[PDB]
Amino acid sequence: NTPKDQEIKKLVDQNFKPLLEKYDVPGMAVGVIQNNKKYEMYYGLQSVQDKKAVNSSTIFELGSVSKLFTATAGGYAKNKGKISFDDTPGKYWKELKNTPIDQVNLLQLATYTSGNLALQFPDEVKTDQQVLTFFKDWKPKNSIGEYRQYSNPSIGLFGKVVALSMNKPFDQVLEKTIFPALGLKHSYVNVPKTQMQNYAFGYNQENQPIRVNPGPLGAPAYGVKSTLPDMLSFIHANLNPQKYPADIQRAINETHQGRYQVNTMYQALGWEEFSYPATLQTLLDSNSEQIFMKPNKVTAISKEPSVKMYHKTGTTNRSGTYVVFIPKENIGLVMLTNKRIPNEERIKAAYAVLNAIKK
Template identity: 45%
Template sequence: MIISSRRTAIAFICSSVALSSWAADDAATIRAVVDTAIRPLMAEHDVPGMAVAITIDGKPTYFNYGVASREKNTPVSETTLFEMGSISKVFTATLASYAQVTGKLSLDDKPGKYMPQLKGSAIDKASLLNLGTYTAGGLPLQFPDEVENATMAAYFQQWKPDAAPGTRREYSNPSLGLFGHLTALALKRDFADAMQTQLFPRLGLSDSYITVPKSAMANYAWGYRENKPVRVNPGVFGDEAYGVKSTAVDMLRFVQANIDPARVPGPMQRAVAGTHVGYFQVGGMVQGLGWEQYPYPITAERLLAGNSATMIHEPNPAKQLARPHLPSERTLFNKTGSTGGFGAYVAFIPETRIGIVMLANKNYPIPARVKAAHAILEQLGPVTK
């Protein structure tokens, strides 16, 4: 029944109708809207640089602000590389969806199928779906400091749940990280290699990386923390949970693929659409694989609640939907991402064919990102009831 419902959802997503009445080439008007939201935000939070990208009816517009490096005074451009932080989780989820579409794994599988050392442990009672939706039963936001790559398996062997799988959502890098790790094992590939040689090319992303090559380092922005330049220092499952570096061009191309999965060929089309299926109701939000979903139109208050510290740092009751959520109504999808020196936000509404990407080289407050994006989308939408 889950598979049948998922296919129905994918068919609906791939056939969505454009509803936006905006002229996609009205760049001057869009710039005024974006400037009004972004310039005060950067001033208030001392953000060195931002790349903002808007897509309307499949046509992109880019707006660049400030610098990628204060030391070198390098201006931000749409080809500047930013750290995506937890937006990487959506890419990990897309890779898992691709593995499912191509028959390499099932979301109903248990971790022990791919890591035999986990068979019979508490984590093996959770499914891959639970790991991909943070509903395994109480995995923490971060690994304990003493956990290293060499002791990761032992950590999961000894982990004790606080709740039954599927009963609560607890946002977790170990949960999503293990989901990505198991996906790579199912594909019989190194995770970073699978992302960089399988996923990104099939999505048409030419400047997205887990490991930034020397040839692209000149485009890699410096993040800023306490006015000091920093870049991500990956830990256990860092690649899977927060390791993607990308540009406004590539991220907007990814958003466009999510708005219209038919833009990408073959199994990847179904993989992208598969990440739009919702599985758990958590307050006013539906949790899918990577993306978080809200009924559209939506108020700023409701969107802020779904991206609040309570949703990130505390366990929240989760109700598994009787069948996977079919986006039969207008739906807004979003995801935030942060590292020590970077902050990002992505949101889009397939039915209106409007999406936004906001990339910054400072980890400024999430509410500020959500408010700015909502204000922009409201002008382009509107998005409030």
């Protein structure tokens, strides 16, 4: 183990490992990628009932971090000419033609500015048929494009349209096109039976194992599962897109462009973006209740910040996910767990590790 191996292990042991006992989390995988070198730390149990330890093959649910793959698929479709972000959803989902939702464009769906879509579908919307009925009956409220409200229905519709534009179901868009283009070999929307023994159980607040299939249009919002080595490769592709072939390189760069600004945060496709260096308070504020749950007025970007960093939290439940990268520093970090941990704690631990790593 190199001098870097030891230093990084120590930093991760100092800042992430205590979270396991503090929040009774069965298992965790934490990785750092720096200058094309991976550093992987595994702790605890993949499955409590099986006494299977977390390892490099463990597959974790990504939760909301799944949206980063929806974003990449959309950047891919757009740069192949299959969609334009100025298109509306009825161009592709023909039953939405001549309905009010066909007045919202795809970029506005992908970046949560339709003006009338909340965090979740209404409780009564449970089947694919009911989702279509929901969108046909939809009416706008706030001026389209002017207010951000984080929303699983919003990006789910975006992902459904992306799949329609590529003439494949969304699961196939990821498993047959996007994941292979990124070199990921153990990332899934549907975990195959030959991998079930590697699939971590999620654990609720009562520490019981929980597994559920997605709701309607759920896969683009929270439906991806992946390993720590695969997620480090994904961060590498975001740090060095120029090393990848053009179609996926263009897709990745598309997810890095700021689309509008809310206070100190810039919304890109999937990724949240910040001027580097971002103070700890700026990163914490991006996960305030105000930003997460309320409608916030957006402002057009004058010019993008000159030096940037990017992160995404994978809230949900039965899992904790956090990913962050800094192009200037050629470094990034991934945290995966099989139990929820307060976002505040994920951000603080990653901030301390990244601020201490020697160049």
